[PDB]
Amino acid sequence: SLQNIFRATSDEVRHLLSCDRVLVYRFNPDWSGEFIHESVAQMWEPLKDLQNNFPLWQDTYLQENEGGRYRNHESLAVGDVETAGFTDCHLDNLRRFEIRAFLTVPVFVGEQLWGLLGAYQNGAPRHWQAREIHLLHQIANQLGVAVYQAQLLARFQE
């Protein structure tokens, strides 16, 4: 349904970026959220297993700030988490999952922030390129459309 769409999308980013993990995050109406889909290289445990054994610092930032920078269509592009100046808790979280560089972009459904699309590299910093960021935005835009049109089709319910 939307599941094979998330799967197709997540696998597409992972291959085009040759990264370690790709995640789709979905917001709730109160701006809490969760990761609802992953594509991950064979090397690494699924997120869900990590989450069940490897505790994290609580992270309520996005929720408290109703989507944070994503709300204004901004993205995060991080070549090295170790030099980025994150809070200690955020770095410690990223470190727990061996994330060393990542990209995170907004996903808009209609004109509302629906989620995030994240791409992660473990173990070594990255020199992200503009065309990689551009392609990630294109994919994120297409995902938004797909979800938007699946909502419209649901709305068609008689």
Ligand X SMILES: *[C@@H](C)[C@H]1/C(=C/c2[nH]c(/C=C3N=C(/C=C4/NC(=O)C(CC)=C4C)C(C)=C\3CCC(=O)O)c(CCC(=O)O)c2C)NC(=O)[C@@H]1C
The span of 2-10, 60-68, 105-113, 139-147 binding ligand X (CB under 6 A) equals 60-68
At residue 23, what is the residue type? Answer: L
Binding residues for ligand 3CX, how many (CB under 6 A)? 5
Among 57, 129, 145, 149, binds ligand X (CB under 6 A): 57
Q: Output 6 or 128, the one with its CB closest to ligand 3CX.
A: 128
Print the SS3 string covering 94-114.
HHHCCEEEEEEEEEEECCEEE
Q: Per rule CB under 6 A, is residue 128 in the interface with ligand X?
A: no
Q: How far is CA 29 from the centre of its chain?
A: 18
Strand partners, 52: none
Please tell me whether 28 is known to bind a ligand. no
At residue 139, what is the residue type? Answer: I
Q: Per rule CB under 6 A, is residue 68 in the interface with ligand 3CX?
A: yes
Q: Output 80 or 98, the one with its CB closest to ligand 3CX.
A: 80
DSSP string, 48-100: HHHHTTS------HHHHTTTGGGGGT--EEES-TTTTT--HHHHHHHHHTTEE
Q: Using CA atoms, how far apart are residues 89 and 141, in angstroms rounded to an integer?
A: 31
The span of 8-16, 80-88, 94-102, 137-145 binding ligand 3CX (CB under 6 A) equals 80-88
Among 86, 122, 133, 141, binds Na ion (CB under 5 A): 86
Please tell me whether 9 is known to bind a ligand. no
Q: Which helix (H) or strand (E) holds 135?
A: helix 130-155
Provide the binding-site residues for ligand X, judged by CB under 6 A: 25, 56-62, 68-69, 76, 87, 89-90, 93, 97, 104
**Residue set of the binding site for (2R,3E)-phycocyanobilin:** 57, 59-60, 69, 87, 89-90, 93, 104, 120
